[PDB]
Amino acid sequence: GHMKYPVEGGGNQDWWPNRLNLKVLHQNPAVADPMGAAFDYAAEVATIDVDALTRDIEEVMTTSQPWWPADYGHYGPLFIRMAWHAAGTYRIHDGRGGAGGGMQRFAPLNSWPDNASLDKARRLLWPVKKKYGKKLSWADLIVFAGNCALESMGFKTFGFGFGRVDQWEPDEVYWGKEATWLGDERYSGKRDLENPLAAVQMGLIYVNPEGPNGNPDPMAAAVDIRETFRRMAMNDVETAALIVGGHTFGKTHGAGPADLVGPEPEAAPLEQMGLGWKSSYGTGTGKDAITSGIEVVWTNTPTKWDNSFLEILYGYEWELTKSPAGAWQYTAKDGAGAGTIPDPFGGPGRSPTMLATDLSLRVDPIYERITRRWLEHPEELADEFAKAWYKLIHRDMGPVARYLGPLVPKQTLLWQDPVPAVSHDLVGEAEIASLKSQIRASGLTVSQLVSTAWAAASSFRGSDKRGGANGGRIRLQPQVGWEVNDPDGDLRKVIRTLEEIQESFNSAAPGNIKVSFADLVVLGGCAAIEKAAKAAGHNITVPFTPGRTDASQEQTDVESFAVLEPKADGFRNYLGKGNPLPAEYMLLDKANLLTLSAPEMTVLVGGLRVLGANYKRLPLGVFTEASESLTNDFFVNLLDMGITWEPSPADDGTYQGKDGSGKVKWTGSRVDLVFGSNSELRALVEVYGADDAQPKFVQDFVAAWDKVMNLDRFDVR
Amino acid sequence: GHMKYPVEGGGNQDWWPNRLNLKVLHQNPAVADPMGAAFDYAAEVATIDVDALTRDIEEVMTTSQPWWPADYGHYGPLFIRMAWHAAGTYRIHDGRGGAGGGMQRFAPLNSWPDNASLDKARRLLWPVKKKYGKKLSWADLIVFAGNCALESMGFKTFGFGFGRVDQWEPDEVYWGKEATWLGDERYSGKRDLENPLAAVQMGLIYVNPEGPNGNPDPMAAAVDIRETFRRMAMNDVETAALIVGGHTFGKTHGAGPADLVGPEPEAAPLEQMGLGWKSSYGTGTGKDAITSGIEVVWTNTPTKWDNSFLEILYGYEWELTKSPAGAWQYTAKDGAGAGTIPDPFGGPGRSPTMLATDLSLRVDPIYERITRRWLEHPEELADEFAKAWYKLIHRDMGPVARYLGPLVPKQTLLWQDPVPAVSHDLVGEAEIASLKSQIRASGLTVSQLVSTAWAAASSFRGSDKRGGANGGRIRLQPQVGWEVNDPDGDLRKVIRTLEEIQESFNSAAPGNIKVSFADLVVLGGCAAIEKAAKAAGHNITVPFTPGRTDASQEQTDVESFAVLEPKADGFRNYLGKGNPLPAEYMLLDKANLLTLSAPEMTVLVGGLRVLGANYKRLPLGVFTEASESLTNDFFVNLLDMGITWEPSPADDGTYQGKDGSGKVKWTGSRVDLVFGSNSELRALVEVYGADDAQPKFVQDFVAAWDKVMNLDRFDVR
Numbered sequence A, B: 001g002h003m004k005y006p007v008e009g010g011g012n013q014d015w016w017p018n019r020l021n022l023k024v025l026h027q028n029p030a031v032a033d034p035m036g037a038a039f040d041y042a043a044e045v046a047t048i049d050v051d052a053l054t055r056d057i058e059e060v061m062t063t064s065q066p067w068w069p070a071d072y073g074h075y076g077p078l079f080i081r082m083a084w085h086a087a088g089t090y091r092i093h094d095g096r097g098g099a100g101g102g103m104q105r106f107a108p109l110n111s112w113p114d115n116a117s118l119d120k121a122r123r124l125l126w127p128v129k130k131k132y133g134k135k136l137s138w139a140d141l142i143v144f145a146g147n148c149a150l151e152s153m154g155f156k157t158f159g160f161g162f163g164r165v166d167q168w169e170p171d172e173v174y175w176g177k178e179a180t181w182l183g184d185e186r187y188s189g190k191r192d193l194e195n196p197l198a199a200v201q202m203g204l205i206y207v208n209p210e211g212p213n214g215n216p217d218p219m220a221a222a223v224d225i226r227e228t229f230r231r232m233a234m235n236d237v238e239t240a241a242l243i244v245g246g247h248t249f250g251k252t253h254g255a256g257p258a259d260l261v262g263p264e265p266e267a268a269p270l271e272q273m274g275l276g277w278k279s280s281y282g283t284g285t286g287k288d289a290i291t292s293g294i295e296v297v298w299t300n301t302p303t304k305w306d307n308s309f310l311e312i313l314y315g316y317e318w319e320l321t322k323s324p325a326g327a328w329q330y331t332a333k334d335g336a337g338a339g340t341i342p343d344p345f346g347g348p349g350r351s352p353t354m355l356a357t358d359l360s361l362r363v364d365p366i367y368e369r370i371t372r373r374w375l376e377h378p379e380e381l382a383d384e385f386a387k388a389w390y391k392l393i394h395r396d397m398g399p400v401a402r403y404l405g406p407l408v409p410k411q412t413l414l415w416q417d418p419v420p421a422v423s424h425d426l427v428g429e430a431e432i433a434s435l436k437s438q439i440r441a442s443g444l445t446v447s448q449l450v451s452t453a454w455a456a457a458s459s460f461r462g463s464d465k466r467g468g469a470n471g472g473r474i475r476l477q478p479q480v481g482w483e484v485n486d487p488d489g490d491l492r493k494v495i496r497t498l499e500e501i502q503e504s505f506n507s508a509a510p511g512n513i514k515v516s517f518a519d520l521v522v523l524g525g526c527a528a529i530e531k532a533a534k535a536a537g538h539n540i541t542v543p544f545t546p547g548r549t550d551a552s553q554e555q556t557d558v559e560s561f562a563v564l565e566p567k568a569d570g571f572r573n574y575l576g577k578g579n580p581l582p583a584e585y586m587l588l589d590k591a592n593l594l595t596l597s598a599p600e601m602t603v604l605v606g607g608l609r610v611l612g613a614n615y616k617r618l619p620l621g622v623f624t625e626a627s628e629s630l631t632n633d634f635f636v637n638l639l640d641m642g643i644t645w646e647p648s649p650a651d652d653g654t655y656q657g658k659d660g661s662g663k664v665k666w667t668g669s670r671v672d673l674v675f676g677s678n679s680e681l682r683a684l685v686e687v688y689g690a691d692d693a694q695p696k697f698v699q700d701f702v703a704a705w706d707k708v709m710n711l712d713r714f715d716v717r
């Protein structure tokens, strides 16, 4: 296996195939962003005429282009699938995927077999992107196209928020271990899906339209649908509503032999201008179009919202049959309803058809009773579908503060992990300063304070922008019993103490100024850091931005927050069972979810060790003589060639480091020692380990600490 | 075959193995740099105490550490090998490798077979880096430790320049296609080494120390020595000076069998802390050290400069033997010189040895002539080694303005491609205005003025920082005769006119203001771009930094400049024969060498095309109807779905774009069409092709043009 020039993908991974890849800590570099550092997309979208935009999208939807002719003269349904697939890569195990970065226009998603024909779909929208320019991201435009198509065709959606900022480089995400398109190496037992995957095969959105592994058993397919949709945050009602609403519109495309469909866009030749799946069957487009291979028109009104889907589904009995491309699909028994389903280009009427996965909605007991109801109550269908469609298209949006434009309903939605609004006034400097002092007198150790503060804010993941310290959800279930949060010890005692100063400041409130318990957690860790820095000769002040609000168990979907629990957090030297990769890979992964740079992770790890942030106050990595002092000691001692490291006898994944006398002087995890072993981390360590580095380490530690405290704070930026 | 987590190296390269890798246009991104944005290494080293730095380095050289005890109680020889290997990766074909970025501390170079034991060498100097911190780069220290080692042991070096800026991410370089260490797949013809390479095997600095492919034949080895050292800028005299002066010091290491040496640093377990090649042979170090597996001590004075090496080489007859690890070496015949050679740790005394490649200096007719002369006149050896070591340790520093500190010698060196000092007052704003207008009245076209300026300035490559518009070498051999600069017609016409303008301005200037030819070439293109921006309805002024001076032919080494000749320049739609990859990979490589970002690269192609910069003024990519006009027409038309693109029937690497009538409207190359085809590049094209994009396009194109004109201008930086 030969080596390639860098410009062809060659590099150090070819020589050391499973080495730590720090490039996950500089995804989307700024060198590669064509917009200024000063580019402010929020400011840009504020200026967008949404009616004009909707109109222009309306014109695109009904102007057929010769190079991909519009089914029934309306691109609407294509655009809805496009939007549904854009959002449809989301997964709750890491919150990756989804439509929020517009990743569908980049590798690999732009070439997934399930995203076939969406190269022409996105391409049709260029006249729009061309007219609105920097005021409209592709990311906004792709889902807003779907939303408009829904409206254009008779369905009133719940609303839309703009604000997805375009990126310039594909998000690097694990979609599975299979090196084959459509491959399946992800299951175990009886249909246990490999975490963190939410699809049944490589390059599928959710499930196989011909049933699992091509076996068109609607009862079996429902097992997959239920499971994959639940990993994309949709329960049974949401799932059934979404499918019915989706397949109320448009058509599948499978007019001929699929071996006449050329390479996917990333592999296609240059003259195809980013498009792929060029096809030699017929005209290759329109009446001859091939996409999935299936040939199904679910309803007789493919460009109108009505209840056809559930009437056809229940009004006929279903025979297994074959598309013109050898794909399993269902059609009506007894030749019933001949010629009732209209042809996309004026040809003869056809018979009713369904997908294997559509019949699941009628065969599976839980789905059957949900959809039978909607057969006699379409207003309920229309309602649960709007709520679910809105949720689908905004899952990765983050806190509601991020939603932009004139189309965001004010209504509270529990799935957004809602936070009460700032009601009273906000603590100013004098007040802030005071409360640092009381917190310092609380009797809470720097270890207690810092570790609790880190526990709240570090709950944030930049993938879907959930979690974080706003909400005060650390004192609520489930966060309060998380083994990493070690409720066992002082989580309660710190919670209980910290609410006391909430009251004491509030019960003796000067006027209208109040403090949330969510803020005291963050102010606590802040003030402790100030203390531990003065203990080390440095008088400094840690920034603190108020405005967080408390929140009740009632506004905290316990099972939704389950997925935000760390199975590992190197910054506290915690490693639970079940992790997919050694502890140093989980370190980097956690830092990527925290939006941290490689230098930021480094200074954070070093700082937190010497402060006591370790899970169960363990000594691993605590390379300092001093107690609760803010030194660069961790870096200095890591570089001390006087220490010899050897794996612990007990196979803990612990190491001992001995001095000259052979006495054990230090212990550490793999997480600790990777900074001395990895050639690129040790470079950073050596920056912060030098004689002239103590003030810079502190300065950089604070700025990165303040960065984690502020991760979820879109209300103030 | 299996897909891996991005943190373990997964990505889109795995699905599309030979795809363009735009990550080459954001090497070493700011987010991964731990210093602030205000950091200026030049400012920091400028204030180092060199005298104290030297004493501390001398202190380390004579202070043996138990984990790698010092041969003869002196690390000096080990540090010379380290400096020579750091600089020794340099190759002329593309200017890459060398010591300039301190890449030896990063993969793959820190794990090269030829760099075994250097892991400990670099480790030994942490006490020096630790002490000076951000005043002293690893790059500067690594090569300075070797220079200090030389003077410590009796050799007065010529001087030394600080200024190598440390990096944080391995420079990705093509070192060959061999996926096996020490593999050889790089010769065709009769012993022709593949370009750009300059080593005979993968992970060698230059040549195999046991002769070609381990055939210990001095005469044949010599042919490799000659050719690799030539591709590293060293002629016969410099090469022999280097090998003699080098092996005047220290010893090789092979006390035991080589399969007792553990994995190289990047494959070594965490506890080894970046050190590799753990040896289970004896103590694994010191008297037992195994680096190369050869066990030669050259001189009887390993820690002192003298003429012992050539005295030993010529005072004995040599015969082939095996080291304790079974490697080929030579030893004296007839048990002569037994015991005359000291052991590194106490030791019984041993008899003369040389490497096969050392005998080449005596067996090869050219080298023998040189080395005999120095046997009889060793003062001459001292001089040539001083010049050649200085060249070696500084070959990639770039212009002499980058050399910092009190040890920088003042003499001009032809190999530095020198440039005259500014002799007069430089042009101010009024002179620059007047001269711009004189250029616009001259008769030279926008096309001629932009082409000339681009040809001069784009000769810079940021690898070794050679070339550029300063020096005015576009009017000298060889640049004036390069095919891409197409001297059959306009270039000499252009040169004459700018000289006439320079003469007439200088002979009438105010006070003592004078202007160089070199400045007028760049000024000319700046003036052309303002005129064309105006024709497109923009009133921009293109910045301009005076202060280039005019080299003479005598200060211009014709042969040394040959490696700078472009065999591909996508910015001019030029593609010669003999490039390693297709045209679009060469475009990126050219952008990389110019230090351009993907957005900067995209804006320049767009601008250069409509401006007329194309080699031979061909229409490929000239997607505009306007002459001499700086519009964004290239991106607008590239994105025009009304054009249909097919490969030209003449199979000539061009393409035809037809509109609706079926008439050929545009033509283009792989370089043009890759901006409409690559999904990352098309994203950038969509920014600059929007309706609102045209002022942003002019602004960024001007900024990138300015960056390119100033690439070599370290005299103002």
Ligand code: HEM
Residues within 6 Å of the ligand: A071, A077, A078, A080, A081, A084, A117, A206, A207, A208, A209, A225, A242, A243, A245, A246, A247, A249, A250, A251, A252, A253, A254, A290, A291, A292, A293, A294, A355, A357
């Ligand atoms: C178990 C869940 C689902 C399965 C198995 C599935 C599968 C499919 C398949 C195979 C096609 C054929 C594509 C082609 O050949 O053109 C299709 C089309 C379509 N899908 Fe679904 N999908 C699912 C869920 C959804 C959802 C949740 C939505 C929207 C909320 C949706 C909206 C659409 C639309 C509008 C089309 C027609 C596109 C057009 O007319 O060109 N689907 N679906």
Ligand code: HEM
Residues within 6 Å of the ligand: B071, B077, B078, B080, B081, B084, B117, B206, B207, B208, B209, B225, B242, B243, B245, B246, B247, B249, B250, B251, B252, B253, B254, B290, B291, B292, B293, B294, B357
């Ligand atoms: C034909 C080119 C050369 C070859 C084949 C060659 C080969 C070698 C080899 C095999 C070693 C022993 C490695 C070990 O086990 O430690 C060695 C050592 C050394 N080489 Fe070279 N070398 C060459 C040129 C140079 C040059 C240009 C220099 C410096 C100017 C140099 C300086 C040294 C030094 C100082 C050592 C001593 C290492 C120590 O004392 O620890 N060599 N060389």
Ligand code: NA
Residues within 6 Å of the ligand: A248, A249, A299, A300, A301, A302, A303, A304, A305, A306, A308, A309
């Ligand atoms: Na319908």
